Every structure is written in C-alpha cells, then in structure tokens.
Design goal:
With about 180 residues, this protein is an alpha/beta fold. It has one domain (about 1-180): Leucine Aminopeptidase, subunit E, domain 1, CATH 3.40.220. It has five helices and seven strands. It has a seven-stranded mixed sheet, with helices on both faces. The chain is globular. The N and C termini lie close together (about 10 Å). The structure holds 2-cyano-~{N}-(1,3,5-trimethylpyrazol-4-yl)ethanamide (GV4) and chloride ion (CL) (2 copies). 2-cyano-~{N}-(1,3,5-trimethylpyrazol-4-yl)ethanamide binds near residues 51, 123, 124 and 165. The PDB classes it as transferase. The entry lists the keywords PanDDA, SGC - Diamond I04-1 fragment screening, macrodomain, XChemExplorer, transferase.
Length: about 180
C-alpha cells in the first residue's frame, strides 16, 4: 500500500519510499548532519549528557542547555522544542528515550508539519540510556511514519533519516526495511 524498494544511493546509506516520504538509514555521528530538525533522545529532565545526548548538548552549546532546563521547570513536558545552537538545524526536538517511541516520532512529524519543514534527522531513539531493544525501536519508528502517511498528514515533510551510532543497530534497521519492501 505504501512501501517502495530498498536501494543504496550513497556509500553506507539505505533508502526506500514510504508514500511520498524518502526514509533513509546510515551509521555515524548525528551532530555532523544538516536538517530542518535534529532529534535528541534524553531523560525526563531534559538535562542528560550521556551517549547521543552528550554529543548533542556539547555541540549545540550552553544557550540550548539553558533553554532546556528553563522549559523543564515551567510545566510537565513529554518533549521540548529549542533552537539549534551550533548544530546545523533550525530546531532541536528533545524527546524522552524511555517513552513510547512510536508516540515520540508521531509528535516530531506533527511539529515539523506545523513549521512547514521538509527534513528530519533522528537517532535510534531509546537504545542508549533507556535500554529499549533495537528491533522494537526500528519497528516503532517505521510504524509512526506509515501511520502519518496513511492519515494523509505528510505535506511539507519529504525526508526522514535515522543516523545510528552502532553499525550493529543499523543492521537491524536494514532488515526491517527489507521485511516491509514492495
Ligand atoms: C551517539 C551515541 N553515543 N553512544 C555512546 C550511544 C550509546 C549513542 N547512541 C544513543 O544514545 C542511542 C539513542 N538514542
Ligand atoms: Cl535513549
Ligand atoms: Cl543511535
């Protein structure tokens, strides 16, 4: 109904279509990416500095750290939106690594449509400090994108890329894409 064919457009990168969206996976350091939104996977206090969160907060800088703690004390948030700081993006969306991953990705997609953004880059949300299983995380991320497309909600969003720290976790995402392909 929705899935295209898996191919490799560039060395180490795998892609397929999900409706109108190009979905891609690759290994590497997410802080070197350019996109309208970069996603951080953090704690419920939005002040973790371990694994991906360490790299993101150190690169983004102290003004983004302060934005995070200020919003955290104002209300109870499931996720927060800050500036990009010194990352190559327009906004960072900080999601809670222990939360339901499908729910978190659905929120990121909706927030990106609200801003008329076209590109998103995310890590393998939940597989660091939160210790969620990589196979369940891959299934949840791709399920969120499928639901978003099925509901007719993709208008501005055109590209969603997962940049993954461990090559062994990339292998799990690749296998899930091959399971789904047309
Ligand atoms: C970038 C990075 N460095 N380290 C040491 C780890 C575990 C990661 N990835 C995550 O934290 C996964 C998620 N979310
Ligand atoms: Cl995590
Ligand atoms: Cl990762």
């Amino acid at each position: 109904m929705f899935y295209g064919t898996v191919s490799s457009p560039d060395s180490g990168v795998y892609e397929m279509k999900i409706g109108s969206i190009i979905f891609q996976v690759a290994s590497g350091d997410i802080t070197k990416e350019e996109a309208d939104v970069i996603v951080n996977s953090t704690s419920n206090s939005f002040n973790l500095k371990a694994g991906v969160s360490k790299a993101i907060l150190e690169c983004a800088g102290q003004n983004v750290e302060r934005e995070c703690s200020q919003q955290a004390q104002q209300r109870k948030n499931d996720y927060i939106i800050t500036g990009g700081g010194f990352l190559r993006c327009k906004n960072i969306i900080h999601v809670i690594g222990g939360n339901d991953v499908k729910s978190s990705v659905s929120s990121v997609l909706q927030e990106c449509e609200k801003k008329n953004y076209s590109s998103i880059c995310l890590p393998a949300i939940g597989t660091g400090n939160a210790k969620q299983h990589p196979d369940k995380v891959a299934e949840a991320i791709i399920d969120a994108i499928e639901d978003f497309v099925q509901k007719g909600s993709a208008q501005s969003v055109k590209k969603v890329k997962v940049v993954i720290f461990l090559p062994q976790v990339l292998d799990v995402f690749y296998a899930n894409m091959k399971k789904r392909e047309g």
